[PDB]
């Protein structure tokens, strides 16, 4: 009977909330007491990437903190250079609607998917120098929202359909299917050990998936609207979220609770991208009001503002060494801050 | 110069990637993008067949101009989370099944879709080429069963051209942005070869406004 199970579900969710409330000793705002403040952080643009000619929807740094990748609304995909300002490669895309990028940890592959429900993976370090499709991943029913790389042999994709998929490259089919969400899944971020990732849906819940087992471990409710951005703490024991509520939350993976709510009265625009800086002290956020922000982590006080664009900032991301940050907005210019 | 031999060649490579990127951006910018939306089984098949999973596009050319028809209506997702991907689209070809009024009625749902798409923040400047198809079925259905069931506000008589104009202005009066955009209504059926001519006439009229705005005459 439906009533013989919905009552049990409500009771078990109440037990979940009670168990959460029992383990909440002190809020992290009370724990970070009498602590040296970060102070205002000065952030100047170092490079400006003036190649694209349309709206930039995604971006991903490499592992050498040297190259970039961008997905503009045109049928192109530029693999930028960071210390200098040149273009390593330009990819003529098969579908102008693209919302995803993923740079290989070894730099040999780039993922690319959008509204076509197809994840196109592009081989870079190839004889007969040219960038060709390694595999055209098929098996999704909605638009693919974000791509991640475990290695050169695996890829984790989050799509509009209420599921996440872990793919294989030798055979282009899925190996696990994380079908546990409701609503469109918008963002995800892998872990330093690449064993767990959390996907963020439009039902305002983040679920911690287990790559090896293929089953969900924890669900993170308590957030208001649909969430569009997730990045882990560099320790891999916490993750931020970004919603259209104009509020960010820093959860944890060992208490399953909330630690900070990152909201301000003057901001009403939703968050589009979230990326921690190294050491986890900072929280960068890609807002919609033509502007970014850098929130301090241990105390939710806001650090220096980050405004260099005139349109919606879609994506941003810190390098793997913590050196630079590249904000890619809806205007065709990226901006590598420092 | 303070640049290496490989660095100068890298700058050369970047510069010609810029040139080949411009040679494609200028080519694609001249092409017209026409988003095609509507209701489920609202006659999109016959119209995508008339003018020559995910998003399925079409490239039909009339009077030497390359068009693009993005049929993203077969997506089955939250429309508000990918509708911002269609910034700068020249027009939105919206199609309403006229004869589907006596069929939980769904023209009210389509009207709610129209007033949510025309008043969207991303589609303020984009015009809507509103289509009204299955007029042959609508004519017979008006004579068979009265139309006043759907609209309690309707009070007119049993005239075909009267009812068609009534629902036309009912759909037209759904926008709160009465000046920033225009709605080009049309009546069409299967036995009509004038649809492509009408949409070309509308796209010429809207690119006239587009380039007048680009020069800042408006």
């Amino acid at each position: 009977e439906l009533d013989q199970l919905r009552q049990e579900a409500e009771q078990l969710k109440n037990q979940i909330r009670d168990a959460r409330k029992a383990c909440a000793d002190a809020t992290l705002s009370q724990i970070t007491n009498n602590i040296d403040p970060v102070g205002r952080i000065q952030m100047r643009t170092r490079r400006t990437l003036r190649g694209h000619l349309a709206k930039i929807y995604a971006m991903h740094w490499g592992t050498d903190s040297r190259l970039l990748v961008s997905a503009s609304q045109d049928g192109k995909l530029i693999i930028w250079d960071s210390y200098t300002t040149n273009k390593v490669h330009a990819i003529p895309l098969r579908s102008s609607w693209v919302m995803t990028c993923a740079y290989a940890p070894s730099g040999n592959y780039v993922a690319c998917g959008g509204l076509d429900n197809i994840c196109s993976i592009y081989n870079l370090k190839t004889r007969e120098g040219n960038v060709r499709v390694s595999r055209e991943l098929a098996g999704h029913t909605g638009y693919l929202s974000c791509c991640r790389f475990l290695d050169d042999n695996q890829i984790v994709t989050s799509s509009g359909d209420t599921t996440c998929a872990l793919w294989d490259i030798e055979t282009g089919q899925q190996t696990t299917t994380f079908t546990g969400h409701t609503g469109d899944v918008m963002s995800l971020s892998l872990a330093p050990d690449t064993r767990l990732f959390v996907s963020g849906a439009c039902d305002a819940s983040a679920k911690l998936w287990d790559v090896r087992e293929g089953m969900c471990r924890q669900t993170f409710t308590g957030h208001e609207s649909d969430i569009n951005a997730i990045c882990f703490f560099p320790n891999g024991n916490a993750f931020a979220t970004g919603s259209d509520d104009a509020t960010c939350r820093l959860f944890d993976l060992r208490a399953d609770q909330e630690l900070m709510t990152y909201s301000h009265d003057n901001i009403i625009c939703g968050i589009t991208s979230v990326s921690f800086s190294k050491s986890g002290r900072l929280l960068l956020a890609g807002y919609d009001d033509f502007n970014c922000n850098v929130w301090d982590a241990l105390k939710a006080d806001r650090a220096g503002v980050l405004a260099g664009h005139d349109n919606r900032v879609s994506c941003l991301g810190v390098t793997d060494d913590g050196m630079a940050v590249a904000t890619g907005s809806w205007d065709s210019f990226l901006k590598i801050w420092n | 110069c303070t640049l290496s031999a490989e660095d100068k060649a890298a700058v050369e490579r970047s510069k010609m990637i810029d040139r080949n990127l411009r040679e494609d951006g200028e080519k694609a910018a001249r092409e017209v993008k026409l988003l095609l939306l509507g209701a489920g089984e609202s006659g999109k098949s016959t119209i995508v067949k008339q003018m020559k999973t995910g998003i399925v596009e079409t490239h039909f050319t009339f009077k030497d101009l390359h068009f693009k028809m993005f049929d993203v209506g077969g997506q089955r997702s939250e429309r508000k989370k990918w509708i911002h991907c269609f910034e700068g689209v020249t027009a939105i070809i919206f199609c309403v099944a006229l004869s589907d009024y006596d069929l939980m009625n769904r023209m009210h749902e389509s009207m709610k879709l129209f007033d949510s798409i025309c008043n969207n923040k991303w589609f303020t400047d984009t015009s809507i080429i509103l289509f009204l198809n299955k007029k042959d079925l609508f004519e017979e259905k008006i004579k068979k069963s009265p139309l006043t069931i759907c609209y309690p506000e309707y009070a007119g008589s049993n005239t075909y051209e009267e009812a068609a104009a009534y629902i036309q202005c009912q759909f037209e009066d759904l926008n709160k942005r009465k000046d920033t955009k225009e709605i080009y209504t049309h009546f069409t059926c299967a036995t009509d070869t004038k649809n492509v001519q009408f949409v070309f006439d509308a796209v010429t009229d809207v690119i006239i406004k587009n380039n007048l705005k680009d020069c800042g005459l408006f």
Epitope: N86, E128 | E6, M16
Partner: single-chain antibody
């Protein structure tokens, strides 16, 4: 894949000939083609260069202005016309593929070469190792030396390495200092500092026998080094 080059033969001095190769198997329009010659009993000698789309054309001091080079992207071919051939121009002319982006492998593929026989302030790469005997399973550190600090201010050093088996086209080994081109075993590991470089082989088999030339790419005209004959 292959770069077959055609032209040359028994020629008389002064005669003008066109050396052409037909590229087949890559994006010829995206590769900056080169032209490297080798005298019948001497080392390599740079000749010319064309960037992608014929944007940049360079020549060596010997062939400066006297030879004309060009490319034809639609036909996937590379051209180089000689004028006033002299007896000091006999060589085997190799067509060298090269691409220049970050982390690329310039001078990766080398053509088979054409036989040319006509009857009748620079960087110097010093390497005196020649007729040196080698036994399989041993380790040989082929020394090298330049006349200019190849360590540019932009971090990396623009020194390459190449291998030439007896009777075959040259092959790239180490595309910077302390790198390794694709298709090369990890036996070869470069090690250099300033104007002193060595190609360290941890353990060598019986198939990697030949002559090892060094070549700077800091600035043109891309000087080479002498031969290094590893005798079995």
């Amino acid at each position: 894949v292959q770069l077959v080059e055609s032209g040359g033969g028994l020629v008389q001095p002064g005669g003008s000939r066109k050396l052409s190769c037909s590229a087949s198997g890559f994006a010829f329009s995206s590769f900056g083609m080169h032209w490297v010659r080798q005298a019948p009993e001497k080392g390599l000698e740079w000749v010319a260069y064309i960037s992608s789309g014929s944007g940049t054309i360079y020549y060596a001091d010997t062939v400066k202005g006297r030879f004309t080079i060009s490319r034809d992207d639609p036909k996937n071919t590379l051209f180089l016309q000689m004028t006033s051939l002299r007896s000091e121009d006999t060589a085997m002319y190799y067509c060298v593929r090269s691409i220049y982006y970050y982390g690329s492998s310039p001078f990766d593929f080398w053509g088979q070469g054409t036989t040319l026989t006509v009857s009748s302030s620079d960087i110097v790469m010093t390497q005196a190792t020649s007729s040196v005997p080698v036994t399989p399973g041993e380790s040989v550190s082929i020394s090298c030396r330049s006349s200019k600090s190849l360590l540019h201010s932009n971090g990396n050093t623009y020194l390459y390495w190449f291998l030439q088996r007896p009777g075959q086209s040259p092959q790239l080994l180490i595309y910077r200092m302390s790198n390794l081109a694709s298709g090369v075993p990890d036996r070869f590991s470069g090690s250099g500092s300033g104007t002193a470089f060595t190609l360290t082989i941890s353990r060598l088999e019986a198939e990697d026998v030949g002559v090892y030339y060094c070549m700077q790419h800091l600035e043109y005209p891309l000087t080479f080094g002498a031969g290094t004959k590893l005798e079995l």
